[PDB]
Amino acid sequence: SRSESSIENFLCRSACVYYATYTNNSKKGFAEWVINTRQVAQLRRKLELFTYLRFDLELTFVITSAQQPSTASSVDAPVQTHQIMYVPPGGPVPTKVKDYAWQTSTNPSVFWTEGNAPPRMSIPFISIGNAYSCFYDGWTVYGINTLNNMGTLYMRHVNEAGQGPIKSTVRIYFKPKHVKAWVPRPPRLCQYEKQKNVNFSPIGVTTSRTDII
Amino acid sequence: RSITLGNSTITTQNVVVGYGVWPEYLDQPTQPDVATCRFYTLESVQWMKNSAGWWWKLPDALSQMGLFGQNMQYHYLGRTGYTIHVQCNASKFHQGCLLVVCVPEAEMGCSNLNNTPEFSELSGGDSARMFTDTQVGESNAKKVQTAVWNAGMGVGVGNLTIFPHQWINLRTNNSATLVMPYINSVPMDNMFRHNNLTLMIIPFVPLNYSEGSSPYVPITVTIAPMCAEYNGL
Amino acid sequence: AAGYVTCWYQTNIVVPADVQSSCDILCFVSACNDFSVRMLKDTPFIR
Amino acid sequence: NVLTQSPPIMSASPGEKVTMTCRASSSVSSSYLHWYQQKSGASPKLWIYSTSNLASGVPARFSGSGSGTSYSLTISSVEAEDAATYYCQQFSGYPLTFGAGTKLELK
Amino acid sequence: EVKLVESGGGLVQPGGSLSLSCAASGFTFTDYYMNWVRQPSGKALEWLGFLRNKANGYTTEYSASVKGRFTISRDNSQSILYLQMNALRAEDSATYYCARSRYYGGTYRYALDYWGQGTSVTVS
């Protein structure tokens, strides 16, 4: 029973990494997420066991809505539709809801009505180098590594509101595929303090006992 | 015994080689060999009683060492391998134990929780930086956190043996030898912005001697580049 | 100029207890067997 | 991190058993808390290091204890030379903060 | 025996500078951490900073309030210890000590065993 410790069965799991809200009428309701691996603390520790990784990606969004308190007089709305835009590394970036960057041509986006299966999409391995780098001892600012930059995501409604505000949440799920690892490293002892860097506070090695015998 | 390279010669007598591979060759690159393949002996550090440890950043420690320091500034890219010889000379009346490890991509953490360490405090130009056995303060601006029981990387110091390592035990052993290939994602990288290796020496069981013996044991590190090739016309 | 044979301390002399530390070094010289001479003269190591 | 000792002034007759406390705001490790004793107009002296171990040349009447965030120093029998001021020290992060001070006046 | 004396105290104007000196005798000076603890007139003690031994590179770790104003250093030839003060204010009138530290196990607990006799510095 030695096969559940394989790399394909150790890292190819699904994990909630982001959770954001956006409303439709407030003229600054749209989500935002720069795709990285250092978001949640549990998935980060399983990825810093190795130094160089290489994987495809699979994202699945579980989008739901909830009615905000409107004014009066028989609120009725049809089914809603969301647009989940993906910006490649080095592309145009939106800044408002109604913007030029949404209707561009080289940003692949999905359109999804409510009441169906949730909208999966898959991102291939996009990098100039031959592998992602989980660590980088060198300057670009120290320890940044501008080579593994996978892109950003953007979500918004495409229905204009007529009688009632509607806010919606979204839980981005995350799943690597065809994982290859290289050069293993010892697991992190100290806690995780910041997102960008590997800064820490010093801690004892092990919990203590009363004597040696 | 008595190996020679270029115009330099050392004297040896067990060698552990990398991750199982030997360092070998691959616009267009040029391959200089007659003037870089020699033993650049770094100067010796002293091991006292209450010592803590040392570290060198590897393509930074040879940045002023002769012709290898000239090819780092003239050529933009490049890739090398290394061959490290460590040997400390103690008598039969001393005792202690070292750990000679060679960490690839050893990203260190600053003392302040928000900043990143400056350039002069990560790597001393052909001079060994030192760990401490106490904490580094929080109030100073930008300095490397050098608590030795966390090895400066926020990791357990005991689990550092997963990297290619070699024990120096003064009871039975005297020397260590490592051969490290080129480990990087891109096939040819810059040599100023990046330090792809880090050689660490940590004393686990500290030095001890009786009254009368010499109170320090010097360590000598000798590095030699292997299969280097640069990029230019 | 014709050369120099200077010698440098790398590390100190590490020595145990109850041993002297001041050691000495002798130096020898010879001919490497492929060398020739010509045009004999008299020696200047005389009155 | 601050240390609050209690009581600030404490009096005891010779022959009784007396105790003082030293309370921290956060959790301080048990091996990093020491006790000092400064007499009237003299330099201070180390009394108990690592919260339970006696110093060199101290009498065996003193004994410290406690763990977590509350530590205590108790004297078994009060004599005539142990009327002074006692401080407690800590280290969880820099700097090293001293206590307020507990004064022991004889009766 | 451990014998620590210190001198250099006196009166000095606010906004001025003053240099103390603490001398050590009776032990190997390049082996122990040397602290600096001041104390106001009958109040609680305050810690300023220490300087590590030769095996750790002679670095300093000041406190938070005196960072940039004070300066701790030692002299290479003989066994003496310095403290360079700058930009003195009215609250620096205190009694300055000169403590030693030591290794109890092979570990470094943060105790201060041997203290100097104490010099005084006032400002006005």
Side-chain angles (χ1 to χ4, degrees), chain E residues 49-118:
Chain E
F50 63 92
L51 174 131
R52 324 209 196 193
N53 46 3
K54 202 181 63 171
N56 296 147
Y58 285 141
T59 76
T60 63
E61 308 290 322
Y62 310 108
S63 163
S65 57
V66 302
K67 172 72 175 185
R69 303 212 278 103
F70 288 168
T71 290
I72 312 181
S73 43
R74 61 162 292 271
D75 181 23
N76 43 297
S77 158
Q78 67 262 43
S79 90
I80 214 169
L81 183 65
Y82 292 150
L83 173 58
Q84 178 78 28
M85 306 194 281
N86 290 134
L88 292 171
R89 306 169 199 174
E91 53 276 1
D92 298 349
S93 278
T95 313
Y96 286 79
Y97 292 94
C98 177
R100 207 197 55 168
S101 288
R102 55 157 303 198
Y103 285 83
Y104 283 112
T107 53
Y108 178 65
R109 290 93 184 260
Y110 283 82
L112 312 179
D113 43 350
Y114 286 94
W115 295 63
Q117 86 272 50

Side-chain angles (χ1 to χ4, degrees), chain D residues 5 20 33-39 44-49 73 84-90 96-99 102, chain E residues 37 45 99-101 104 110-115:
Chain D
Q5 309 184 207
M20 49 203 68
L33 184 129
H34 325 294
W35 292 83
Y36 297 94
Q37 171 197 87
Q38 179 192 18
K39 281 190 173 183
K45 287 166 54 55
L46 180 87
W47 217 242
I48 286 182
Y49 75 106
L73 168 62
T85 319
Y86 296 94
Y87 302 94
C88 53
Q89 202 200 335
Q90 63 102 28
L96 317 177
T97 61
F98 285 86
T102 290
Chain E
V37 167
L45 299 149
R100 207 197 55 168
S101 288
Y104 283 112
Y110 283 82
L112 312 179
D113 43 350
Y114 286 94
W115 295 63

Side-chain angles (χ1 to χ4, degrees), chain A residues 85-92 100-109:
Chain A
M85 203 178 66
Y86 171 58
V87 176
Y100 165 67
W102 299 95
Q103 290 100 18
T104 187
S105 157
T106 175
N107 288 176
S109 84

